[PDB]
Structure 1
């Protein structure tokens, strides 16, 4: 079952992820079929910016992720959330308005 998931890398207290296309039943950090992109959870801050805003750096190959999604790949809950922001899929969860 092809899955678009995150392979955790980095050091202690410094998580760095790797968006990959691997088989479901395989080690988390094994060499995948491809590497779609990376993901950094800790938000950064613009160098010369004092407004206080924060952003998250995410490198992603949309063209390559779309093909795999179209042939039956099942992204995890976290990768699904990212693809929703990009506009490829619909949000799986939403904040209750009532």
Structure 2
């Protein structure tokens, strides 16, 4: 089963992720089939922006990710939430309004 998931890298208290295409039953950090992108969870801040707004840097090869979702790849919950923001899949969870 191919999966679009994250490979935890970095150092202690400095997480960094690789968006990868790997078989489900393999080691988390083993060499995958492809590296589709990267994901940094800690939000950053523009250098000369004093407004206080934060952002998150995410590099993603949308063209390569769409092909794997088209052939039957199963993204994890975290990668699903990311792919839903860019506008590829529908969200799995939503804030209840009532």
Q: Shorter-normalised TM-score: what interval? A: over 0.9
Report SS of the residue matched to 1:79. Answer: helix
**Which stretches of structure 1, 4 residues or more, deviate above 6 A after TM superposition?**
none
State the Cα distance separating 1:13 from its structure 2 match.
Answer: 0.2
Report SS of the residue matched to 1:55. Answer: coil
TM-score by length of 2: 1.00
Report SS of the residue matched to 1:64. Answer: helix
RMSD, aligned CA: 0.2
**Distance in 1 between the 2:28 and 2:35 partners?**
13
Provide, for residues 54-96 of structure 1, a one-character-per-residue CA deviation record: whole Å limited to 9, x for no partner: 0000000000000000000000000000000000000000000
**Distance in 2 between the 1:84 and 1:97 partners?**
19
TM-score by length of 1: 1.00
User: Unpaired segments of 5 or more residues in structure 2?
Assistant: none
User: Unpaired segments of 5 or more residues in structure 1?
Assistant: none
State the Cα distance separating 1:14 from its structure 2 match.
Answer: 0.1
Map of 1:30-45 to 2, 5 A cutoff? 30-45=30-45
Report SS of the residue matched to 1:74. Answer: coil
